[PDB]
Amino acid sequence: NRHFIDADPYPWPYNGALRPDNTALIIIDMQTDFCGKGGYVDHMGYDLSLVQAPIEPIKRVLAAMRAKGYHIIHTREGHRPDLADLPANKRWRSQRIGAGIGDPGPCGRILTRGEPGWDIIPELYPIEGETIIDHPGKGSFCATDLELVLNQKRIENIILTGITTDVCVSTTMREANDRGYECLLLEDCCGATDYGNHLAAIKMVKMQGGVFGSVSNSAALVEALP
Amino acid sequence: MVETNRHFIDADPYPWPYNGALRPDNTALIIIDMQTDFCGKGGYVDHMGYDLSLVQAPIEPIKRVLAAMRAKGYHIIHTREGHRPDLADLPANKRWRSQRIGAGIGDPGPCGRILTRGEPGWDIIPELYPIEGETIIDHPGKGSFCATDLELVLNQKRIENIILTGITTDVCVSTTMREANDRGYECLLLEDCCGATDYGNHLAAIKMVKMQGGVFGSVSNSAALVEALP
Amino acid sequence: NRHFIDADPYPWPYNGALRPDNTALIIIDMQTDFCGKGGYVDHMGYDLSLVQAPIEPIKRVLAAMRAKGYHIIHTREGHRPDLADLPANKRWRSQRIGAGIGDPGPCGRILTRGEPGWDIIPELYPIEGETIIDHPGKGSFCATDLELVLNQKRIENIILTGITTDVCVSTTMREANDRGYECLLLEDCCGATDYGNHLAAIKMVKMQGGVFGSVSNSAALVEALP
Amino acid sequence: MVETNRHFIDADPYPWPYNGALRPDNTALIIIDMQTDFCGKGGYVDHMGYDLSLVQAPIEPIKRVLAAMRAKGYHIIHTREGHRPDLADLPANKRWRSQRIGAGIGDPGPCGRILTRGEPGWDIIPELYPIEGETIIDHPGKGSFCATDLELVLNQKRIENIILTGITTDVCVSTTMREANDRGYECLLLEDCCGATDYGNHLAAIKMVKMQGGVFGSVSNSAALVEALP
Secondary structure (H helix, E strand, O other), X not given: OOOOEOOEOOOEOOOOOOOHHHEEEEEEOOEHHHHOOOOHHHHOOOOOHHHHOOHHHHHHHXXXXXXXXXEEEEEEEOEXXXXXXXXXXXXXXXXXXXXXXXXXXXOEEOOEOXXXXXXXXXXXXXXXXXXXXXXXXXXXXXXXXXXXXXXXXXXXXXXXEEEOHHHHHHHHHHHHHHOOOEEEEEEEEXXXXXXXXXXXHHHHHHHHHHOOOXXXXXXXXXXXXX | OOOOOOXXXXXXXXXXXXXXXXXXXXXXXXXXXXXXXXXXXXXXXXXXXXOOHHHHOOHHHHHHHHHHHHHOOOEEEEEEEOEOOOOOOOXXXXXXXXXXXXXXXXXXXXXXXXXXXXXXXXXXXXXXXXXXXXXXXXXXXXXXXXXXXXXXXXXXXXXXXXXXXXXXXHHHHHHHXXXXXXOOOEEEEEEEEEXXXXXXXXXHHHHHXXXXXXXXXXXXXXXXXXXXXX | OOOOEOOEOOOEOOOOOOOHHHEEEEEEOOEHHHHOOOOHHHHOOOOOHHHXXXXXXXXXXXXXXXXXXXXXXXXXXXXXXXXXXXXXXXXHHHHHXXXXXXXXXXXXXXXXXXXXXXXXXXXXXXXXXXXXXXXXXXXXOOOOOHHHHHHHOOOOEEEEEEEOHHHHHHHHHHHHHHOOOXXXXXXXXXXXOOHHHHHHHHHHHHHHHHOOOEEEOHHHHHHHOO | OOOOOOOOEOOEOOOEOOXXXXXXXXXXXXXEOOEOOOOXXXXXXXXXXXXXXXXHOOHHHHHHHHHHHHHOOOEXXXXXXXXXXXXXXXXXXXXXXXXXXXXXXXXXXXXXXXXEOOOHHHOEOHHHOOOOOOEEEEEOOOOOOXXXXXXXXXXXXXXXXXXXXXXXXXXXXXXXXXXXXXXXXXXXXXXXXXXXXXXXXXXXXXXXXXXXXXXXXXXXXXXHHHHHOO
């Protein structure tokens, strides 16, 4: 009763134990300031097109997985408004490049919880029953309840999407993988503002027999999802 | 004439550490996973075929950094990827992938059971071997913090700054750096003191550090470190 | 320049390094449902006076520590409204005794974030700059950002107050202690609805040369606080 | 006869485990810190002046539970409180308190360095010694989860239910139970298979488990467990 998604370097999940009850989609950090028109990333002159590219593929995956009753998780990078959870180095670096965390930006205080720019874009907005992880690190597990939630939901398999490929997506995948979760990265459902780093982050997954999991795409997923 | 207790290493994208608080008592070198099976002649990677040279390249630069930091009384930490001999800490997926490529964790290899604690091939190579007082982290994950006492040890030693070296750049080195960075540690990657199975992935992992004002920390090299280390 | 508070079994903190910048008060779980008139604990017929007894001493400590610019932290036990962070056993036990987590109670859904009964009582309410930890376990560190926050604030010493002595107070103290924090329990600033368990939890702290830290009282603290 | 795959142990305040899902593959015994120095002459606990009879009392009941659970193929886990020999994992306060009462961690004792890994007094007593395949957790905290791989191991073994035994009831046993419970594990404390430095603290720690509908789990005894274990 095994089901697999075509993937590289191996058909996923490794053991074919692919069910709604043990599998989650995670949509990482699809926040206005990071990928929306007029957000701080746009205003900083970064290559915003590369982080908008995954929106439509993600929307298709999200619709398909909702329809089939899979677990859906979303994440938002951000800090408490009093900045208690903000490391001094993280803050200093952000100030040095003119995107200081907690400072005013075009859509509110940058990377600050409760602000408009920090929220998820409307095109990928959560619905009730889809857990949202608010995380202060680049890996979504650090200092959050993500692992607790995954464990109570008895999730074994994680399908990763979102931004950026080389930062929060890769870090969260690595954290999950170390703990035993079986992870699939959808290459057309992630992006970074450096395309080379996007492609390299994906390549890294596949090495050594799928060191961090396996890689597929939205069409292959939607076609074969049970 | 004018003396300062702030000290920096020339680094990219910013001089490191960010605040110049660079002292023996708050700074550690970490040498990641310089183990025989991974970089050594006759280990399991060698027995599979062609190319150890990329993961051996950092040995001499690491040795220079290690010697310099020992002489100046900096904290020195080493790590080893590996599993309990009964494999209780080995996830099923990790095991299955390693079996599928012919390097099954816990399976017999030319230097003992692959990635298995206590076996000859699993140990750190003699030329970078720890000495007394240099903590060794035995880790079952690619990130050295997961399921270990690394963070507890760092905190009791009041370590603020970490200098990362070892192998592989894109796997255990990058994962450990990301975990440390998230927790507030200030990290420097020495680019000539790491290497990977694919040189392009090595270079990309280094580039990733530098983006967005040094998202994971900063990058330097052994010569710049040794020259400016207080 | 060492400063100590009189305490049992040793003067606290162990090394006398007692400063506003390295020391936090933590006020644990002083929530309406747990200690307020008409909350679920009151309606169940427990002896509410034992968990109200610490309010006035806590107020005195809180005022003194605010005035001197010490770090102030508050905690609230609770669950996400969709109960994603609620273990099945925790839920089942609560249902079995007629205080089901997430079920309707006299002040709103029991132990559910955002509900009236779940919030901190008005007499001990946080002010801006005082971090609040929302925790799904009895130990406030589990699945939260408390440790991350303590580390960024460079906190070494923790003064524990709140309720209940034997559950969240003792558990949070034990977690902190294991990680190297130096902890003081203020015995008149905690309570439980079984006074024997309160007293025993306090006794446990002092054994073996102060296995979990040291114990004092609000008067001794306020008198000697630098 | 009507047969069921739900099975319960008579326990207080509720029959355990809550859902009756009690099988060898999902259930572990954990034997906490039955080490020579906690329950034998010359140890840490001995140096503090406590009465050894209270911590020896659980030996025979634990032995019976251990034998029964081994025979039925249940998971068996053991723990040892202790520190790396260089004391890198030893908080300064923990060390200072132990020195103040004359049982300094790492100081020489009649059975080796107190609470120091690799020393004779730190090892598990022979009457409860692990066998191959029984994971041992070496922990620097009073809660066995802190800074260890216990959680990772539990998760890879798909353990849901934990039966706790060992010493001391109010310190490492209670702390480990609370950590497990918070993470969703379903825990049973065997009251005749634990003991403490003060019998009243033992009894109170057990009572604490039962309050509020079994806030930390449920409580039973060796005879009830062995009688009903599937």
